[PDB]
Write a protein that binds this ligand. Structure first.
Ligand SMILES: *[C@@H]1O[C@H](CO)[C@@H](O[C@@H]2O[C@H](CO)[C@@H](O)[C@H](O)[C@H]2NC(C)=O)[C@H](O)[C@H]1NC(C)=O
Ligand SMILES: *[C@@H]1O[C@H](CO)[C@@H](O[C@@H]2O[C@H](CO)[C@@H](O)[C@H](O)[C@H]2NC(C)=O)[C@H](O)[C@H]1NC(C)=O
Ligand SMILES: *[C@@H]1O[C@H](CO)[C@@H](O)[C@H](O)[C@H]1NC(C)=O
Ligand SMILES: *[C@@H]1O[C@H](CO)[C@@H](O)[C@H](O)[C@H]1NC(C)=O
Ligand SMILES: *[C@@H]1O[C@H](CO)[C@@H](O)[C@H](O)[C@H]1NC(C)=O
Ligand SMILES: *[C@@H]1O[C@H](CO)[C@@H](O)[C@H](O)[C@H]1NC(C)=O
Ligand SMILES: *[C@@H]1O[C@H](CO)[C@@H](O)[C@H](O)[C@H]1NC(C)=O
Ligand SMILES: *[C@@H]1O[C@H](CO)[C@@H](O)[C@H](O)[C@H]1NC(C)=O
Ligand SMILES: *[C@@H]1O[C@H](CO)[C@@H](O)[C@H](O)[C@H]1NC(C)=O
Ligand SMILES: *[C@@H]1O[C@H](CO)[C@@H](O)[C@H](O)[C@H]1NC(C)=O
Ligand SMILES: *[C@@H]1O[C@H](CO)[C@@H](O)[C@H](O)[C@H]1NC(C)=O
Lengths: 113, 99, 44, 79, 337, 49, 49
């Protein structure tokens, strides 16, 4: 229940959107407008260096917002972000890939064109 | 050769799915029709048989629509191979970055 | 704005910045080198 | 089951026609890619091409199969 | 009949870690080169397992009546054959059917009745002066039984009654399950040269017997055997010896496991799905080899925590006032409604 | 009844999304062939660029 | 029921495949392993000049 910035006419208790979903309800006892948003959902994607190469994996989230790097394509944990850019092999999305580069650990970086 | 291995694995996985789909109940009390026939009378189990006949039905067409769409890129690829056979092999193609 | 029951939009691997950098690279190739770059190394 | 399938035999005909349709589309697909020439030519017995080695793409009579060594390789690579 | 023990100094139980133990055949069918996943009660890998001691050198004798959950894991590195058997039951006061599994020196029997158990059933082994052999005479495991239904006799397993203090040479595992009133026993004898920190080797447990009993089991107790040589006075109060022994007790929980089968139809490796994201990736792909790329295993969803009911401010009220604060009241024969 | 109606709903969306992929793949292949001709060199095909 | 060449462990009765099909059974009398195979099916095709 976030704090909205849109005023409601003084005869309405409900509120819908373009997609016809109840996402704005007026609290009756104090007269404030509160929005309704689903908490969080998504999938658990994993990146793998491959067979006979490594044993550790990293957990990638599709759109859930949070070692730990906040990428544009969600949340990626277990992979260290590095500023330098190389050619990538494992596409993740939003202009960032992942690779196993030097011990040696899994890293995430913007790919090189 | 990734392309031939991918299409063959897709053929086997879809065909194995249809086998595993026959082992599903589709919301009924059993999967195989013989067990329903042996335990329940045909006048009473007709709704159970129909839902089983229903459930297997969409399994057929979803396999068919998947098989019909898979024939599309195979034909689309085969047409591309035929033009490349006609151009790059049976003569010299002036088309740069085509062969 | 699709945040409802069971639909998520996956961001593409290549967004607008890098595809525009691709077009600029191809435009730079076709003005300074003609067609040699698309059939091998760049020839001035 | 077949008695109740009498009401669904029309759709099964559609699926059977579709399965026949993709089958007759498939054995036809091999015709326009490989059967381009109606004459089967042969290589000369003496392989004198000026220096170009063609034994890798030419079939070898040492093996009973008519496939090239590259052909037998790619046959063994894919399952 | 039974006797009571005296208070002495014991050792607290310790906790150890399992290493790829507790895997048995979940079905009686044959699978060759099949990576099959089934839902059954197993022991999780690297799970935390209760450990007990039975070595004399002091005077360690701890056999509590542990609760029986859904499936148990019992592994023992028995060398001198000190362990004897197991008992099961609910209250152990001759009101419900109770198991009695004893591996005797002559034969193995399975009698499940209402035997009146004491606080510590045990077997006594004596050393004869004229005969240089160990013989068991004190059969103090119960008093009597009224009636029962099931009885079974197993194969006459040959047993050694001699106890030593040397290193262990054999490892024995036992799995007891109770689903649909069916008792399931899985066991396999695996030799090893180790005393502690069980190896990471793999050994599937074959089924042994499928005895139908159909009762309730929630408690169990472990039977141990002691020795009475010429050194001890022979009284079970403060002076006794029990050799060197050790046993492990574990509890099973339902988990999803991917089992690997070879050309012989024997289990070789097992992969979990709720332990490691790498293991989850392996078992969702139904393969033991994972290449490089994007893989989707499961989903993630946040659950609500509280439940608030901010009801409106327009809550009204009932007219309980004027009906109580009424100036006029009617007669009893003409009461208002 | 609710589940059967909803599984009926999602299957038509899958089929129409799949045919859109076929058309766009056909168009994306046409862009790659055109640009490999018209941009990455000079194409001798009349009425193609 | 064909004569198979594969031996079964002395605790099993049935035998399945990737499709979990009981294409293998064990005789309960004299311990012989017999396979299960579908009898015959197909279709009648007509060649017309
Ligand atoms: C054409 O290339 C093939 C390579 O496959 C040559 O065959 C090899 O010849 C060498 C030289 O005697 C042998 O040691 C190899 O065992 C041959 N390999 C095979 C697979 O046959 C062949 O000699 C070449 N021909 C010409 C004319 O250059
Ligand atoms: C009947 O009238 C009496 C007198 O007004 C009520 O008693 C009062 O009730 C209010 C309710 O909030 C209190 O605040 C006052 O302190 C009470 N005063 C006394 C002297 O008791 C009574 O509640 C009325 N009956 C009903 C059912 O409402
Ligand atoms: C709700 O009612 C309370 C009294 O019960 C009052 O103090 C408050 O101001 C009211 N809120 C409104 C009218 O929004
Ligand atoms: C993610 O959450 C953090 C804290 O909750 C916040 O600071 C950040 O702005 C959020 N990211 C986005 C993209 O909203
Ligand atoms: C990468 O280098 C830039 C250079 O200015 C620096 O600002 C940035 O912090 C570096 N990133 C990391 C992860 O060290
Ligand atoms: C087992 O449990 C004990 C106490 O509950 C704890 O100290 C020990 O670390 C646990 N072992 C493992 C492997 O977690
Ligand atoms: C061994 O113990 C069992 C358990 O009751 C018993 O039935 C059997 O008689 C014993 N053997 C001998 C030789 O006493
Ligand atoms: C005696 O045996 C019968 C079975 O014949 C059983 O139902 C009954 O419970 C037994 N008696 C007691 C006291 O358990
Ligand atoms: C066995 O125990 C379960 C749970 O305590 C109970 O529901 C069931 O009725 C019991 N059955 C018998 C025969 O005691
Ligand atoms: C298991 O199969 C392998 C494959 O040839 C064979 O070498 C081995 O002897 C078999 N083991 C048994 C116990 O039959
Ligand atoms: C079962 O009995 C028959 C006849 O006595 C015998 O031929 C067969 O071998 C027996 N099967 C066994 C003991 O498994």
């Amino acid at each position: 229940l976030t704090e909205s910035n849109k005023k409601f006419l003084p005869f309405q208790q409900f509120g819908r959107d373009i997609a016809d979903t109840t996402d704005a309800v007026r609290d009756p006892q104090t007269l404030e407008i509160l929005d309704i948003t689903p908490c969080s959902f998504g999938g658990v994607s994993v990146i793998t260096p491959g067979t006979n190469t490594s044993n550790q994996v990293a957990v990638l989230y599709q759109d859930v917002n949070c070692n730990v790097f906040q990428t544009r394509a969600g949340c990626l944990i277990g992979a260290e972000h590095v500023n330098n850019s190389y050619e990538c092999d494992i596409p993740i999305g939003a202009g960032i890939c992942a690779s196993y580069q030097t011990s040696q650990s899994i890293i995430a970086y913007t790919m090189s064109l | 050769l990734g392309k031939l291995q991918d299409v063959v694995n897709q053929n086997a996985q879809a065909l194995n799915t249809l086998v595993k789909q026959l082992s599903s109940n589709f919301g009924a009390i059993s999967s195989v029709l013989n067990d329903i026939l042996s335990r329940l009378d045909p006048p009473e189990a007709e709704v159970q048989i129909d839902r089983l006949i229903t459930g297997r039905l969409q399994s057929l067409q979803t396999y068919v629509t998947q098989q019909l769409i898979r024939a599309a890129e195979i034909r689309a690829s085969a047409n591309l191979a035929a033009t490349k056979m006609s151009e790059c092999v049976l003569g010299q193609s002036k088309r740069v970055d085509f062969c | 704005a699709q945040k409802f029951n069971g639909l998520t939009v996956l961001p593409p691997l290549l967004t607008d910045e890098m595809i525009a950098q691709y077009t600029s690279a191809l435009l730079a190739g076709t003005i300074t080198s003609g067609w040699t770059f698309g059939a091998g190394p760049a020839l001035q | 089951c077949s008695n109740l399938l009498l009401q669904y035999g029309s759709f099964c005909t559609q699926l059977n026609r579709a399965l026949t349709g993709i089958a007759v589309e498939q054995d036809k697909n091999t015709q326009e890619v490989f059967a381009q020439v109606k004459q089967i030519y042969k290589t000369p017995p003496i392989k004198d091409f000026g220096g170009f080695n063609f034994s890798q793409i030419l079939p070898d009579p040492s093996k009973p199969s008519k496939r090239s060594p590259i052909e037998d390789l790619l046959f063994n690579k894919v399952t | 009949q039974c006797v009571n023990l005296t208070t002495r100094t014991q050792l607290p139980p310790a906790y150890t870690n399992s290493f790829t133990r507790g895997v048995y055949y979940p079905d009686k069918v044959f699978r060759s080169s099949v990576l099959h996943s089934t839902q059954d009660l197993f022991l999780p890998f690297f799970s935390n397992v209760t450990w007990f001691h039975a070595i004399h050198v002091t005077k360690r004798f701890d056999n509590p009546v542990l609760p029986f959950n859904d499936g148990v894991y019992f592994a023992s590195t028995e060398k001198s054959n000190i362990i004897r058997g197991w008992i099961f039951g609910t209250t152990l006061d001759s009101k419900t059917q109770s198991l009695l599994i004893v591996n005797n020196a002559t034969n193995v029997v399975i009698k499940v009745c209402e035997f009146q158990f004491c606080n510590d059933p045990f077997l006594g082994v004596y050393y004869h002066k004229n005969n240089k052999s160990w013989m068991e005479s004190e059969f103090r495991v119960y008093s009597s039984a009224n009636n029962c239904t099931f009885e079974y006799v197993s194969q006459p397993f040959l047993m050694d009654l001699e106890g030593k203090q040397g290193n262990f040479k054999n490892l024995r595992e036992f799995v007891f399950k109770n689903i649909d009133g069916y008792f399931k026993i899985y066991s396999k004898h695996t030799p090893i040269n180790l005393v502690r920190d069980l190896p990471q080797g793999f050994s599937a447990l074959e089924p042994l017997v499928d005895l139908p009993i159909g009762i309730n089991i929630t408690r169990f107790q472990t039977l141990l055997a002691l020795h009475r040589s010429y050194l001890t006075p022979g009284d079970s109060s403060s002076g006794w010896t029990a050799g060197a022994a050790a046993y492990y007790v574990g509890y099973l929980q339902p988990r999803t496991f991917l089992l690997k089968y070879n050309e012989n139809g024997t289990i070789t490796d097992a992969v979990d799905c709720a332990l490691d994201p790498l293991s989850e990736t392996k078992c969702t792909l139904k393969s033991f080899t994972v290449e490089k790329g994007i893989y989707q295993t499961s989903n993630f969803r946040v659950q609500p925590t509280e439940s608030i009911v901010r009801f409106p401010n327009i809550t009204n009220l009932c007219p309980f006032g004027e009906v109580f604060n009424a100036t006029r009241f009617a007669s009893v024969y003409a009461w208002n409604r």
